[PDB]
Amino acid sequence: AVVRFVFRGDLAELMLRAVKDHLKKEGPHWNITSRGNELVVRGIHESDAKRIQKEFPSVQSTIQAA
């Protein structure tokens, strides 16, 4: 699956960086990339994808199960 986080406002870059550092610790094996205000996690299990969405529930996110 794929999770995409979209960060908003004047702090978006710093919040992305915070979330990115956190997720690199949760899943050192996850393929994590970012550009602009979007953070993308690939190679994550669909159930783990709903978990990290639920961990940062106020960050807008999408999940692609395919």
Residue numbers in the entry: 0 to 65
Copy text verbatim from the article accompanying this structure deposition.
The RGD (Arg-Gly-Asp)-binding integrins αvβ6 and αvβ8 are clinically validated cancer and fibrosis targets of considerable therapeutic importance. The highly homologous integrins αvβ6 and αvβ8 bind to latent transforming growth factor-β1 and β3 (L-TGF-β1 and L-TGF-β3) leading to release of active TGF-β1 and -β31–3. Here, we describe a method for computationally designing hyperstable RGD-containing miniproteins that are highly selective for a single RGD integrin heterodimer and conformational state, and use this strategy to design inhibitors of αvβ6 and αvβ8 with high selectivity. We found small α/β ferredoxin folds were able to scaffold the RGDLXX(L/I) binding loop without clashing with the integrin while making additional contacts with both α and β subunit (α- and β-loop respectively).
Following two rounds of design and optimization (see supplementary info for details), two high affinity variants were selected for further characterization: B6B8_BP (av6_3_E13T) and B6_BP (av6_3_A39KG64R). Affinity maturation identified a substitution to a lysine (A39K) making a salt-bridge interaction with E316 of the β6 subunit while the LXX(L/I) motif remained fixed confirming the importance of this motif for selectivity towards αvβ6. In B6_BP, the β-loop is positioned to confer selectivity between the two integrins, where residue K39 faces E316 on the β6 subunit and K304 on β8. B6_BP binds αvβ6 with a higher affinity than αvβ8 on the surface of K562 cells, with a Kd of 0.11 (±0.09) and 580 (±40) nM, respectively. As intended, B6_BP is more selective for αvβ6 than B6B8_BP. B6B8_BP and B6_BP do not cross-react with RGD-binding integrins αvβ1, αvβ3, αvβ5, α5β1, α8β1, and αiibβ3 at concentrations up to 200 nM in cell surface binding experiments using K562 cells stably transfected with different RGD-binding integrins, corresponding to >1000-fold selectivity. As B6_BP binds to A431 cells with higher affinity and is more selective than B6B8_BP for αvβ6, we selected B6_BP for further in vivo experiments. AF680-B6_BP rapidly accumulated in the αvβ6 positive tumors and reached a high tumor-to-muscle fluorescence contrast ratio within 3 h post-injection.
